[PDB]
Design a protein around this ligand. Structure first.
Ligand SMILES: [Cl-]
Lengths: 269, 11
């Protein structure tokens, strides 16, 4: 290509169009592109339809593109990975009519302040959803009904104050949940359901230790080796398990899993 | 390195 780097790795074709002052998709890219990098351009509006000529395209990065609108015309039947991180999106692109094979969606570090009812409808193959660093306060009911195969979910570093009780319903395969550094104060009873969850990050929330925290206290007991602290810059296999990171607010660091619950339920005596 | 890379041990 005269502008983008093209890197052939056996059958694989990875095209690097990163940081090239592009304001539009270049028109002469290989028809056989597997992976397209469009990071750090200026793609304010981007049309998914423009990528239809690329039949073998499985991964697209539009990260750090000052993107504000992603037009969802047309259909990309083989796109598996879409990275929209570090942009300016003020509402979530609604993609289920467009990317039926999507397994990975990253929209971390945008300007999202809520997700609409049905946001993920039609993304039935989704396995990973990253929403770290937006401005979310809660989630709509039924958010993950469309996505029963979900494996990893990040809501880290939002400003969440309520989680719907059935959020995790029918997630038979969930393996990582990141909820650290929000404004959460309680967990609805039964929130976790009955499936094993190997990695939960729950620290940096002002948990309210009253009788309604008992559910969470008992879950933390049964799951102490599954509760971790996020460390930046490393692999997750490098990170410390620490059930005591999860602390009662207004407490001086009293660990929720320790919560006595003495005299619950509170009644007149 | 990103959250996503970290969770796959690809940092
Ligand atoms: Cl109470």
């Amino acid at each position: 290509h005269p502008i983008c780097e093209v890197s052939k790795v056996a059958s694989h074709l990875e095209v690097n169009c990163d940081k090239r002052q592009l304001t539009a998709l270049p028109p002469d890219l290989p028809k056989d592109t597997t992976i397209l990098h469009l990071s750090e351009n200026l793609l304010y509006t981007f049309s998914l339809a423009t990528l239809m000529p690329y039949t073998r395209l499985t991964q697209l990065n539009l990260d750090r593109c000052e993107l504000t609108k992603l037009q969802v015309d047309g259909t990309l039947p083989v796109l598996g990975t879409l990275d929209l991180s570090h942009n300016q999106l003020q509402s979530l692109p609604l993609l289920g009519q467009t990317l039926p094979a999507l397994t990975v969606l990253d929209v971390s570090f945008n300007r999202l302040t809520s997700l609409p009812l049905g946001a993920l409808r039609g993304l039935g193959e989704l396995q990973e959803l990253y929403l770290k660093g937006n401005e979310l306060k809660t989630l709509p009911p039924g958010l993950l009904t469309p996505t029963p195969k979900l494996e990893k979910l990040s809501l880290a570093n939002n400003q969440l104050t309520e989680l719907p009780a059935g959020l995790l319903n029918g997630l038979e395969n969930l393996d990582t949940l990141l909820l650290q550094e929000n404004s959460l104060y309680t967990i609805p009873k039964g929130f976790f359901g009955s499936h094993l969850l190997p990695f939960a990050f729950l620290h940096g929330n002002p948990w309210l230790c009253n009788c309604e925290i008992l559910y969470f206290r008992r879950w933390l007991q049964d799951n102490a080796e599954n509760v971790y602290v996020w460390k930046q810059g490393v692999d997750v296999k490098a990170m410390t398990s620490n059930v005591a990171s999860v602390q009662c607010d207004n407490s001086d660091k009293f660990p929720v899993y320790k919560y006595p619950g003495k005299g619950c339920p509170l009644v007149p005596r | 390195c990103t959250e996503r890379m970290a969770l796959h041990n690809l940092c």
